[PDB]
Coordinates of N, CA, C and O in Angstrom, one line a residue:
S1 N 1.0 -1.4 0.0 CA 0.3 -0.1 -0.4 C 1.1 1.0 0.0 O 2.1 0.9 -0.2
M2 N 1.4 2.5 0.4 CA 1.1 4.1 0.2 C 2.4 3.7 1.4 O 1.9 3.4 2.8
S3 N 3.1 3.7 0.9 CA 4.7 4.0 1.7 C 4.7 2.8 2.6 O 5.6 2.6 3.5
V4 N 4.4 1.8 1.2 CA 4.3 -0.4 2.3 C 4.9 -0.6 1.3 O 3.8 -1.4 0.6
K5 N 6.4 -1.0 1.0 CA 6.6 -2.1 -0.5 C 7.0 -3.4 0.1 O 7.4 -3.7 0.6
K6 N 7.2 -4.0 -0.2 CA 8.0 -5.6 -0.6 C 9.8 -5.4 -1.1 O 9.1 -4.0 -1.8
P7 N 10.2 -5.9 -0.9 CA 11.5 -5.4 -0.9 C 11.7 -5.7 -2.8 O 11.2 -6.6 -3.8
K8 N 12.4 -5.1 -3.3 CA 12.6 -4.4 -4.6 C 13.0 -5.7 -5.5 O 14.6 -6.5 -5.3
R9 N 12.3 -6.4 -5.9 CA 12.6 -8.0 -7.3 C 13.7 -6.7 -8.4 O 13.0 -6.5 -8.5
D10 N 15.2 -7.6 -8.5 CA 15.7 -7.2 -9.7 C 14.8 -7.8 -11.1 O 15.1 -8.4 -11.3
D11 N 14.6 -6.8 -11.6 CA 14.1 -7.4 -13.0 C 14.4 -6.3 -14.5 O 13.6 -6.5 -15.2
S12 N 15.4 -5.9 -13.8 CA 16.5 -5.4 -14.5 C 17.2 -6.9 -15.9 O 17.3 -5.8 -17.2
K13 N 17.4 -8.2 -15.6 CA 17.8 -8.5 -17.1 C 16.2 -9.5 -18.0 O 16.2 -10.4 -18.4
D14 N 15.0 -8.9 -17.4 CA 13.5 -9.7 -17.4 C 13.7 -9.8 -18.9 O 13.1 -11.1 -19.9
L15 N 14.1 -8.6 -20.1 CA 14.1 -8.2 -21.1 C 14.6 -9.7 -21.9 O 14.8 -9.8 -23.3
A16 N 15.7 -9.1 -21.8 CA 16.8 -10.0 -22.2 C 16.1 -11.8 -21.8 O 17.0 -12.2 -22.9
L17 N 16.1 -12.4 -21.3 CA 15.7 -13.6 -20.9 C 14.3 -14.6 -21.3 O 13.7 -14.8 -21.7
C18 N 13.3 -13.2 -20.8 CA 12.0 -13.6 -22.4 C 12.6 -13.5 -23.5 O 12.5 -14.4 -23.9
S19 N 13.6 -13.0 -23.8 CA 13.7 -12.7 -25.5 C 14.5 -13.9 -25.9 O 14.5 -14.5 -26.3
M20 N 14.9 -14.6 -25.2 CA 16.1 -16.1 -25.1 C 15.4 -17.3 -25.1 O 14.9 -17.7 -25.5
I21 N 14.5 -17.0 -24.0 CA 13.2 -18.1 -24.0 C 12.3 -18.1 -25.5 O 12.2 -18.8 -26.1
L22 N 12.1 -17.4 -25.8 CA 11.6 -17.2 -27.2 C 12.0 -17.4 -27.8 O 11.8 -18.4 -28.5
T23 N 13.8 -16.7 -28.3 CA 14.4 -17.8 -28.6 C 14.2 -19.3 -29.0 O 14.2 -20.3 -30.0
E24 N 14.6 -19.3 -27.9 CA 14.6 -21.3 -27.3 C 13.0 -21.9 -28.2 O 13.0 -22.8 -28.7
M25 N 12.1 -21.3 -28.1 CA 10.9 -21.5 -28.3 C 10.4 -21.8 -29.9 O 10.3 -22.6 -30.8
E26 N 11.2 -20.8 -30.6 CA 11.4 -20.6 -31.5 C 12.3 -21.3 -33.0 O 11.6 -21.9 -34.0
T27 N 13.4 -22.0 -32.0 CA 13.9 -22.7 -32.1 C 14.2 -24.1 -32.4 O 14.0 -25.5 -32.9
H28 N 12.5 -24.4 -31.7 CA 12.1 -26.1 -31.0 C 11.4 -26.4 -32.9 O 11.0 -26.0 -33.2
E29 N 12.4 -27.6 -32.9 CA 11.4 -28.1 -34.0 C 9.6 -27.7 -34.1 O 9.2 -28.7 -35.4
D30 N 8.8 -28.4 -33.0 CA 7.3 -27.9 -33.0 C 7.0 -26.5 -33.3 O 5.6 -26.5 -33.0
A31 N 7.9 -25.9 -33.5 CA 7.2 -24.1 -33.4 C 6.4 -23.7 -34.6 O 5.5 -23.5 -34.9
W32 N 6.7 -24.9 -36.2 CA 6.4 -24.7 -37.4 C 4.6 -23.9 -37.2 O 4.7 -23.5 -37.9
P33 N 3.7 -24.7 -36.1 CA 2.5 -23.6 -36.0 C 2.8 -22.9 -35.4 O 1.2 -22.4 -36.4
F34 N 2.7 -21.7 -35.2 CA 3.2 -21.1 -34.7 C 4.1 -19.7 -34.8 O 3.8 -18.4 -34.1
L35 N 4.4 -20.3 -35.6 CA 6.3 -18.5 -36.3 C 5.2 -17.3 -36.2 O 6.1 -16.9 -36.4
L36 N 4.6 -17.8 -37.2 CA 3.5 -16.6 -38.3 C 2.5 -16.9 -37.8 O 1.9 -18.1 -37.9
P37 N 1.5 -15.2 -37.4 CA 0.0 -15.2 -37.7 C -0.6 -16.1 -38.9 O 0.0 -16.2 -40.2
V38 N -1.3 -16.8 -38.4 CA -2.5 -17.3 -39.1 C -2.7 -17.0 -40.3 O -3.6 -15.3 -40.0
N39 N -3.4 -17.5 -41.1 CA -3.5 -16.4 -42.5 C -5.1 -16.6 -42.9 O -5.4 -17.3 -42.8
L40 N -6.0 -15.2 -41.8 CA -7.1 -15.3 -41.8 C -7.9 -15.2 -43.4 O -9.4 -15.4 -42.9
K41 N -7.6 -14.6 -44.1 CA -7.5 -14.8 -45.5 C -8.3 -16.1 -46.0 O -8.9 -17.1 -46.3
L42 N -7.2 -16.9 -45.2 CA -7.0 -18.1 -45.7 C -7.1 -19.3 -45.2 O -7.7 -20.9 -46.0
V43 N -7.5 -19.7 -43.5 CA -8.6 -20.6 -42.9 C -9.6 -20.3 -42.5 O -10.1 -19.1 -41.9
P44 N -10.7 -21.1 -42.5 CA -11.9 -21.1 -42.5 C -12.0 -21.7 -40.9 O -10.9 -22.1 -40.0
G45 N -13.2 -20.0 -40.2 CA -13.6 -20.2 -39.3 C -12.3 -19.1 -38.0 O -12.8 -18.8 -36.9
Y46 N -11.3 -19.2 -38.1 CA -10.2 -19.2 -37.9 C -9.9 -17.4 -36.8 O -10.7 -17.0 -36.0
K47 N -10.2 -16.2 -38.2 CA -10.9 -15.5 -38.1 C -12.0 -15.0 -36.8 O -12.4 -14.2 -35.8
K48 N -13.2 -15.6 -37.3 CA -14.6 -15.6 -36.1 C -14.2 -16.3 -34.2 O -14.5 -15.5 -34.0
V49 N -14.1 -17.0 -34.7 CA -13.8 -18.7 -33.6 C -12.3 -17.6 -32.6 O -13.3 -17.6 -31.5
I50 N -10.8 -17.5 -33.3 CA -10.3 -17.0 -32.7 C -9.7 -15.5 -32.8 O -9.7 -14.5 -33.2
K51 N -10.7 -15.2 -31.2 CA -10.3 -13.8 -30.9 C -9.7 -12.7 -30.0 O -10.0 -11.8 -31.4
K52 N -8.4 -13.2 -30.3 CA -7.0 -12.8 -30.0 C -6.2 -13.8 -30.6 O -5.5 -14.3 -29.7
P53 N -5.8 -13.6 -31.8 CA -4.9 -14.3 -32.4 C -3.5 -13.9 -31.4 O -3.5 -13.1 -32.1
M54 N -2.1 -14.8 -31.5 CA -1.1 -14.7 -31.2 C -0.1 -16.3 -31.5 O -0.9 -16.9 -32.0
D55 N 0.4 -14.8 -32.3 CA 2.0 -15.9 -33.1 C 3.8 -15.1 -32.6 O 3.7 -14.0 -31.8
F56 N 4.5 -16.3 -32.1 CA 6.0 -16.2 -31.3 C 6.3 -15.1 -32.0 O 6.9 -14.0 -31.8
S57 N 6.5 -14.8 -34.1 CA 6.5 -12.9 -34.9 C 5.8 -12.2 -34.1 O 6.4 -11.1 -33.8
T58 N 5.0 -11.7 -33.8 CA 3.6 -11.0 -32.9 C 4.9 -10.7 -31.4 O 4.7 -9.1 -31.6
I59 N 4.6 -11.3 -30.7 CA 5.1 -11.5 -29.7 C 6.9 -10.7 -29.6 O 7.6 -10.1 -29.0
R60 N 7.5 -11.6 -30.7 CA 8.6 -11.0 -31.1 C 9.0 -9.2 -31.0 O 9.0 -8.1 -30.7
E61 N 7.7 -8.7 -32.2 CA 7.5 -8.0 -32.5 C 7.5 -6.4 -31.1 O 7.9 -5.7 -31.0
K62 N 6.1 -7.1 -30.3 CA 6.4 -6.9 -29.3 C 7.1 -6.6 -28.3 O 7.5 -5.2 -27.3
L63 N 8.0 -7.4 -28.2 CA 9.1 -7.4 -27.3 C 10.0 -6.2 -27.3 O 10.4 -5.8 -26.1
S64 N 10.9 -6.8 -28.6 CA 11.1 -5.4 -29.2 C 10.7 -3.9 -28.9 O 12.2 -3.3 -29.2
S65 N 9.6 -3.6 -28.9 CA 9.5 -2.3 -29.1 C 8.4 -2.2 -27.6 O 8.3 -0.7 -27.9
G66 N 8.8 -2.5 -26.7 CA 8.6 -1.9 -25.7 C 7.5 -2.5 -25.3 O 6.7 -1.7 -24.5
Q67 N 6.3 -3.2 -25.3 CA 4.9 -3.4 -25.3 C 4.7 -4.1 -24.3 O 3.6 -4.3 -24.1
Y68 N 5.3 -4.8 -23.8 CA 5.6 -5.7 -22.4 C 5.9 -5.6 -21.3 O 6.9 -5.0 -21.6
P69 N 4.8 -4.6 -20.5 CA 5.2 -3.9 -19.5 C 6.1 -5.0 -19.0 O 6.4 -4.3 -17.6
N70 N 5.2 -6.0 -17.5 CA 6.1 -6.2 -17.6 C 6.4 -8.4 -17.8 O 5.7 -8.7 -18.9
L71 N 7.4 -9.0 -17.2 CA 7.5 -10.2 -18.1 C 5.9 -11.5 -17.7 O 5.5 -12.4 -18.5
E72 N 4.6 -10.8 -16.7 CA 3.2 -11.9 -16.7 C 2.4 -11.8 -18.5 O 2.1 -12.2 -18.2
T73 N 3.1 -10.2 -18.8 CA 2.6 -10.0 -19.7 C 3.0 -10.7 -20.8 O 2.3 -11.0 -22.0
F74 N 3.5 -10.7 -20.8 CA 5.0 -11.9 -21.7 C 4.3 -13.1 -21.9 O 4.6 -13.8 -23.0
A75 N 4.5 -14.0 -20.8 CA 3.6 -14.8 -20.5 C 2.1 -15.2 -21.0 O 2.0 -16.6 -21.7
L76 N 1.6 -14.1 -21.2 CA 0.1 -14.4 -21.1 C 0.6 -14.2 -22.6 O -1.3 -14.9 -23.0
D77 N 0.3 -13.8 -23.1 CA 0.5 -13.7 -24.5 C 1.6 -15.3 -25.3 O 0.6 -16.0 -26.7
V78 N 2.7 -15.8 -24.7 CA 3.2 -16.7 -25.1 C 1.7 -18.6 -24.4 O 1.2 -18.7 -25.4
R79 N 1.2 -18.6 -23.6 CA -0.3 -19.0 -23.1 C -1.0 -18.8 -24.4 O -1.8 -19.7 -24.6
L80 N -1.8 -18.0 -24.6 CA -2.9 -17.5 -26.0 C -2.6 -18.2 -26.8 O -3.1 -18.6 -27.9
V81 N -1.2 -17.8 -27.3 CA -0.8 -19.1 -28.1 C -1.2 -20.5 -28.1 O -1.9 -20.9 -28.9
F82 N -0.9 -21.4 -27.8 CA -1.5 -22.1 -27.1 C -3.0 -22.0 -26.7 O -2.9 -23.5 -26.8
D83 N -3.7 -22.0 -26.2 CA -4.7 -21.5 -26.3 C -5.2 -21.6 -26.3 O -6.8 -22.3 -27.4
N84 N -5.2 -20.6 -27.8 CA -5.5 -21.0 -29.5 C -5.9 -22.2 -30.4 O -7.2 -22.9 -30.8
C85 N -4.5 -22.9 -29.4 CA -4.2 -23.8 -30.8 C -4.9 -24.7 -30.3 O -5.7 -25.4 -31.1
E86 N -5.4 -25.2 -28.3 CA -6.0 -25.3 -28.4 C -7.5 -25.7 -28.7 O -8.3 -26.8 -28.4
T87 N -8.5 -24.1 -28.8 CA -9.7 -24.2 -29.0 C -9.9 -24.7 -31.3 O -11.1 -25.1 -30.4
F88 N -9.1 -24.2 -31.6 CA -8.9 -24.6 -32.9 C -8.4 -26.2 -33.7 O -8.9 -26.5 -34.7
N89 N -7.4 -27.0 -32.6 CA -7.2 -27.9 -33.1 C -8.5 -29.7 -32.2 O -7.7 -29.1 -30.7
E90 N -8.0 -30.0 -32.6 CA -8.4 -31.5 -31.9 C -6.6 -31.8 -30.7 O -6.0 -32.3 -31.5
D91 N -7.3 -32.3 -30.4 CA -5.8 -33.2 -29.0 C -5.0 -34.3 -30.2 O -3.8 -34.1 -30.3
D92 N -5.8 -35.6 -31.3 CA -5.2 -35.7 -31.8 C -5.0 -35.3 -32.8 O -5.4 -35.8 -34.2
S93 N -4.0 -34.4 -33.5 CA -3.8 -34.5 -34.4 C -2.5 -33.9 -34.3 O -1.4 -32.9 -32.9
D94 N -1.3 -33.1 -35.3 CA -0.3 -32.8 -35.5 C 0.1 -31.4 -34.7 O 0.7 -31.1 -33.8
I95 N -0.9 -30.8 -35.5 CA -1.0 -28.9 -34.8 C -1.4 -29.5 -32.9 O -1.1 -28.9 -32.6
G96 N -2.5 -30.0 -32.7 CA -2.8 -29.8 -31.2 C -1.5 -30.6 -30.5 O -1.2 -29.9 -29.3
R97 N -1.3 -31.4 -31.2 CA 0.3 -32.6 -30.0 C 1.1 -31.2 -29.8 O 1.7 -30.9 -29.1
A98 N 2.0 -30.7 -31.2 CA 2.7 -29.4 -31.6 C 1.8 -28.2 -29.9 O 3.5 -28.0 -29.8
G99 N 0.8 -27.8 -29.6 CA -0.1 -26.6 -29.7 C 1.0 -27.7 -27.7 O 1.5 -26.6 -26.8
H100 N 0.6 -29.1 -27.5 CA 1.5 -29.5 -26.0 C 2.1 -29.4 -25.7 O 3.1 -29.3 -24.6
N101 N 3.0 -30.0 -27.1 CA 4.7 -30.1 -25.7 C 5.2 -28.6 -26.0 O 5.8 -28.6 -25.4
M102 N 4.7 -27.4 -26.5 CA 5.1 -26.0 -26.7 C 4.8 -25.8 -25.3 O 5.6 -24.4 -24.7
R103 N 4.3 -25.4 -24.9 CA 3.2 -25.0 -23.7 C 4.2 -25.6 -23.0 O 4.0 -25.2 -21.7
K104 N 4.7 -26.7 -22.5 CA 6.0 -28.2 -21.9 C 7.0 -27.1 -21.7 O 7.5 -26.6 -20.8
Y105 N 7.4 -27.4 -23.1 CA 8.4 -26.6 -22.8 C 8.6 -25.4 -22.8 O 9.7 -24.9 -22.0
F106 N 7.4 -24.5 -22.9 CA 7.4 -23.1 -22.3 C 7.7 -22.8 -21.0 O 9.0 -22.4 -20.8
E107 N 6.4 -23.7 -20.4 CA 5.8 -24.0 -18.7 C 7.9 -24.4 -18.8 O 8.3 -23.7 -16.8
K108 N 8.5 -25.8 -19.0 CA 9.9 -25.2 -18.1 C 10.8 -24.6 -17.7 O 11.4 -24.2 -16.7
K109 N 11.5 -23.7 -19.4 CA 12.1 -22.9 -19.0 C 10.8 -21.3 -18.9 O 12.8 -20.9 -17.5
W110 N 10.0 -21.1 -18.2 CA 9.8 -20.5 -17.5 C 10.2 -20.7 -16.2 O 10.5 -19.2 -15.6
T111 N 10.0 -21.4 -15.5 CA 9.5 -22.0 -14.2 C 11.2 -21.7 -14.2 O 11.3 -21.4 -12.8
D112 N 12.3 -22.1 -14.8 CA 14.0 -22.8 -14.8 C 14.8 -21.6 -14.6 O 15.7 -21.4 -14.1
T113 N 13.7 -20.5 -15.7 CA 14.5 -19.1 -15.8 C 13.8 -17.6 -14.4 O 14.6 -17.7 -13.9
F114 N 13.0 -18.0 -13.6 CA 12.0 -17.2 -13.1 C 11.6 -17.7 -11.6 O 11.4 -16.7 -10.3
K115 N 11.3 -18.9 -11.4 CA 10.8 -19.1 -10.4 C 11.6 -20.1 -9.5 O 13.1 -20.2 -8.8

């Protein structure tokens, strides 16, 4: 509250560390469904159904342009990529499995870097 603060966590490396994690996600072999924005002209249903599209290239652009106020907003966008994937894809499909694998990969990197 006013004039009552928890001890100051050092957040000066967060930007660099989020960038590294994003690089690691981008270079994973199962990243291919998530690297670029879904083509809303060519994928039936996607525009209507997925209210907030998100992808790794868009996260990169946001990150590099100071559009994440903190590391939780970054994590929220990454999770949005996978939540979208689950909404639109059967679990039993290549893309469905890709999204599960990537989400796990991310959550491990996140816990190991910050938790």
